[PDB]
Amino acid sequence: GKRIPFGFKHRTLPHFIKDDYGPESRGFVENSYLAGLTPTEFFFHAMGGR
Amino acid sequence: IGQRIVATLPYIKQEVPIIIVFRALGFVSDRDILEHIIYDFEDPEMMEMVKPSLDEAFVIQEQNVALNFIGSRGAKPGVTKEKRIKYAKEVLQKEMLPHVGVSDFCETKKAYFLGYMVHRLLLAALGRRELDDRDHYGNKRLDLA
Amino acid sequence: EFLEEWSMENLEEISPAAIADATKIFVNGCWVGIHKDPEQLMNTLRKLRRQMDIIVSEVSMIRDIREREIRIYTDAGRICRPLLIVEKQKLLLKKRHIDQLKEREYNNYSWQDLVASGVVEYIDTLEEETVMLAMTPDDLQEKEVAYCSTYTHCEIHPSMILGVCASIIPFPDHNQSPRNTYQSAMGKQAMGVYI
Amino acid sequence: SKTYQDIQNTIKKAKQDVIEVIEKAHNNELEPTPGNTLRQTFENQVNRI
Amino acid sequence: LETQFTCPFCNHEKSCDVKMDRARNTGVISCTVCLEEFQTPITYLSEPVDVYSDWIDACEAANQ
Amino acid sequence: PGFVGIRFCQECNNMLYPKEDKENRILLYACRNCDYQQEADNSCIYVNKITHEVDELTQIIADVSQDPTLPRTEDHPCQKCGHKEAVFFQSHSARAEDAMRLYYVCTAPHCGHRWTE
Amino acid sequence: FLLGQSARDAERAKDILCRLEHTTLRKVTANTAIYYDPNPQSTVVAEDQEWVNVYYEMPDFDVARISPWLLRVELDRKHMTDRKLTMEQIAEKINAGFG
Amino acid sequence: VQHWCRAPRPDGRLCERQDRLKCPFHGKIVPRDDEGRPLDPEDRAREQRRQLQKQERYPSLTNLKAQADTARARIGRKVFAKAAVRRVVAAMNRMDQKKHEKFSNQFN
Ligand SMILES: [Zn+2]
Ligand SMILES: [Zn+2]
Ligand SMILES: [Zn+2]
Ligand SMILES: [Zn+2]
Numbered sequence: 001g002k003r004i005p006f007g008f009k010h011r012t013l014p015h016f017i018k019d020d021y022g023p024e025s026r027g028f029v030e031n032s033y034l035a036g037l038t039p040t041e042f043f044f045h046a047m048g049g050r
Numbered sequence: 051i052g053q054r055i056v057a058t059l060p061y062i063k064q065e066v067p068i069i070i071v072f073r074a075l076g077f078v079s080d081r082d083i084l085e086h087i088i089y090d091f092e093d094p095e096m097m098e099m100v101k102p103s104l105d106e107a108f109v110i111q112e113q114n115v116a117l118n119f120i121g122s123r124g125a126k127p128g129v130t131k132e133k134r135i136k137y138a139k140e141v142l143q144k145e146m147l148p149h150v151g152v153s154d155f156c157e158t159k160k161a162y163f164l165g166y167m168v169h170r171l172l173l174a175a176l177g178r179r180e181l182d183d184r185d186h187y188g189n190k191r192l193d194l195a
Numbered sequence: 196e197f198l199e200e201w202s203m204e205n206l207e208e209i210s211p212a213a214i215a216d217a218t219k220i221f222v223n224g225c226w227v228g229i230h231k232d233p234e235q236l237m238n239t240l241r242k243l244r245r246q247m248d249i250i251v252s253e254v255s256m257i258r259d260i261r262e263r264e265i266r267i268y269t270d271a272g273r274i275c276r277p278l279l280i281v282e283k284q285k286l287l288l289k290k291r292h293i294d295q296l297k298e299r300e301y302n303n304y305s306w307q308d309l310v311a312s313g314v315v316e317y318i319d320t321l322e323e324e325t326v327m328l329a330m331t332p333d334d335l336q337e338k339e340v341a342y343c344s345t346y347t348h349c350e351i352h353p354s355m356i357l358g359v360c361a362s363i364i365p366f367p368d369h370n371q372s373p374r375n376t377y378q379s380a381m382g383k384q385a386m387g388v389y390i
Numbered sequence: 391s392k393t394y395q396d397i398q399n400t401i402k403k404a405k406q407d408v409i410e411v412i413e414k415a416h417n418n419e420l421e422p423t424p425g426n427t428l429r430q431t432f433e434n435q436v437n438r439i
Numbered sequence: 440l441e442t443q444f445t446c447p448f449c450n451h452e453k454s455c456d457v458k459m460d461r462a463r464n465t466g467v468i469s470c471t472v473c474l475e476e477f478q479t480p481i482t483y484l485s486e487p488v489d490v491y492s493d494w495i496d497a498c499e500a501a502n503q
Numbered sequence: 504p505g506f507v508g509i510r511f512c513q514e515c516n517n518m519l520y521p522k523e524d525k526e527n528r529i530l531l532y533a534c535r536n537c538d539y540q541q542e543a544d545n546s547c548i549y550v551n552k553i554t555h556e557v558d559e560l561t562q563i564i565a566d567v568s569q570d571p572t573l574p575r576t577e578d579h580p581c582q583k584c585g586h587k588e589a590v591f592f593q594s595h596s597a598r599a600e601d602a603m604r605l606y607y608v609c610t611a612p613h614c615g616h617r618w619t620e
Numbered sequence: 621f622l623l624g625q626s627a628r629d630a631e632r633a634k635d636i637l638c639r640l641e642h643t644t645l646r647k648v649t650a651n652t653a654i655y656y657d658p659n660p661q662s663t664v665v666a667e668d669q670e671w672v673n674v675y676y677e678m679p680d681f682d683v684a685r686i687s688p689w690l691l692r693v694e695l696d697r698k699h700m701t702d703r704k705l706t707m708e709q710i711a712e713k714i715n716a717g718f719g
Numbered sequence: 720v721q722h723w724c725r726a727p728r729p730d731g732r733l734c735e736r737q738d739r740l741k742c743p744f745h746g747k748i749v750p751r752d753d754e755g756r757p758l759d760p761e762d763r764a765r766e767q768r769r770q771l772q773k774q775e776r777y778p779s780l781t782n783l784k785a786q787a788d789t790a791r792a793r794i795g796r797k798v799f800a801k802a803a804v805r806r807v808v809a810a811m812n813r814m815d816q817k818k819h820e821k822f823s824n825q826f827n
């Protein structure tokens with residue numbers, strides 16, 4: 001029920017800078033299933049499905 | 051109802067106030083112990099976090115007394131004194147924190163490491179660091195053939 | 196041993212007044228010394244590792260910075276993966292290397308010569324907490340609003356975050372995730388030639 | 391293509407508003423709603439956007 | 440930890456028991472069989488096994 | 504108010520517990536262990552901040568400017584050394600999770616100036 | 621469910637609210653300290669000395685019985701008002717409980 | 720806080736205390752004139768009645784009850800009760816519950 005959690009040290013992943021509260025950083029997928037998903041959206045989507 | 055820190059050593063039948071475990075390692079005066087636990091004497095809050103535990107065991111003030119105190123817990127009740135102090139010394143060297151060292155005269159190392167353990171605990175309680183996550187894989191080791 | 200040759204100050208030789216500002220140093224969890232200039236020590240050591248010097252490749256090396264510890268691991272069981280190393284804003288992997296690998300079968304310029312030349316680096320789950328990964332060498336390109344602009348590593352390719360059965364799925368990123376998980380589980384029941 | 395452009399424009403709008411909200415909160419310009427702390431109000435507003 | 444100890448003198452196991460008078464900071468250990476009785480101060484950390492081990496040293500020390 | 508710190512004996516180095524000199528009605532710091540005695544200075548013995556009004560600037564260490572993982576911004580020039588670039592970040596401590604206020608630190612070598620907004 | 625006009629206006633409802641909710645002293649205290657004051661006429665603290673000497677000169681309560689040891693407690697305003705509350709009632713309660 | 724206690728003090732002065740509801744030294748605050756008489760005659764009669772009611776109302780060896788019969792013993796009995804310490808421990812554990820709530824965004 002919450003956005004993706006900060007599992008690294010104030011980072012959702014090591015591709016983002018620290019204390020990043022943007023929509024991309026916490027797991028907003030701005031793509032359709034027909035446009036693909038960029039690798040970080042793929043990982044966050046995996047977490048939700050799990 | 052002040053917070054009182056204690057340690058659970060291996061092969062000692064009861065919990066033990068940590069300040070005792072510092073006495074039994076030969077750092078007898080109070081200030082020498084707070085040199086090893088509190089790496090900076092300016093933060094008052096951690097000092098009054100440590101005060102209660104430094105009161106809890108004001109009674110035991112010398113290395114051999116604390117070694118008695120520890121070894122009285124342990125193997126079998128009715129045992130001579132010298133065996134009791136040998137027991138406590140054997141524990142605090144061989145069994146407690148081996149990775150720091152099993153050889154003798156590893157007591158300044160052992161005291162610094164135990165002070166580190168307590169420092170980390172006090173930060174966790176004052177909130178200056180986050181509680182360790184269990185499912186972080188940095189903390190885990192895969193155990194191959 | 197190398198640390199002793201450097202300006203490490205072993206622990207049984209310190210006045211406890213000094214620890215306040217210095218940086219601690221743990222080698223496999225054992226508080227081994229202290230040091231006064233951390234960053235130079237870290238750069239020295241990472242350089243030594245990058246040269247295949249005394250520090251073997253699989254030696255994780257973290258630097259907690261808010262708290263003042265440096266931690267070095269050599270134990271067994273840690274998991275790690277190779278990444279590309281980044282200069283200021285540029286990979287160290289030039290086309291010299293691609294040229295020499297392309298004839299990997301004549302020059303015997305293998306992968307080992309590629310780690311040996313300070314181009315890839317094994318970074319493990321705990322040292323990742325302190326890197327900044329470019330997903331692809333385009334993140335390096337100076338953007339209109341440079342996102343981070345101080346990257347440390349790159350991914351070799353994003354698609355190597357998948358496994359042996361999930362690497363069969365074609366276009367896995369157009370699928371909903373439980374679909375990919377079932378296919379992973381049904382690709383192990385599929386009659387073929389097993390040997 | 392027209393509806394693709396609509397969709398992209400809506401997404402750009404939404405991300406811009408979320409950036410605005412963030413920098414408000416960075417300037418101490420955001421004030422909690424009744425029954426909710428600052429973290430929770432911040433999160434609730436971003437999720438609503 | 441346990442509380443009943445072999446009498447150091449009559450060698451009867453579990454025949455010694457202790458009374459910790461926390462009011463006076465003094466604990467007594469008494470052998471029911473031989474009626475031997477040992478008195479000694481206690482502090483708020485002390486336990487029966489600590490008291491007992493004062494007795495043994497008192498026995499040996501006087502037996503020197 | 505201000506917090507109150509411990510002070511140690513000069514024979515034992517043990518912590519000097521307080522008590523009162525009733526016949527003089529003045530505060531003495533004494534040693535439970537040795538028989539050393541000292542005359543006090545505070546006249547206060549205990550303090551609790553129920554609100555927990557801790558300022559994080561003390562917790563900040565000027566070395567955090569080295570982090571590559573940590574945001575860099577050009578807009579806020581350093582007040583002290585006049586440098587252009589400075590890192591910034593959240594509070595990130597228990598009892599301080601609210602208040603997404605930012606803390607700024609200069610990124611010049613050996614300037615180490617820190618401030619807030 | 622509120623019964624009377626409290627159903628309609630918010631203020632009456634909030635009154636009833638604060639009259640249900642439990643409010644121990646911690647919730648309405650800023651900070652406390654245990655001073656050593658032998659002489660009430662001369663507090664260690666300065667900012668309190670005014671109302672101090674306003675109280676201690678009139679001998680409704682004995683000065684001889686008083687011990688030199690002190691509690692001083694700080695109340696913060698916005699909390700203090702949220703429960704629509706005043707030091708009179710807290711004084712009253714402390715009288716009631718310990719006598 | 721406008722109205723003043725204004726009760727007649729023994730020194731002839733009127734109280735200047737700014738209490739919202741009650742004077743700690745004169746009970747309930749009633750509105751008084753410049754010379755301290757309550758404006759309401761009924762309130763004055765009630766105050767007079769209350770004042771009248773208030774005005775109306777082995778020996779050589781030590782007695783152990785002297786220690787048992789003292790304020791300090793009473794307070795010690797009250798505070799050092801198993802119920803009281805249990806409530807104290809419960810409240811302090813709820814304090815611990817808040818400092819457990821000091822990890823919002825991350826895993827904790
Ligand atoms: Zn016997
Ligand atoms: Zn002393
Ligand atoms: Zn600067
Ligand atoms: Zn009055």
Ligand SMILES: [Zn+2]
Pocket residue numbers: 724726734742743744745746
């Ligand atoms: Zn009055």
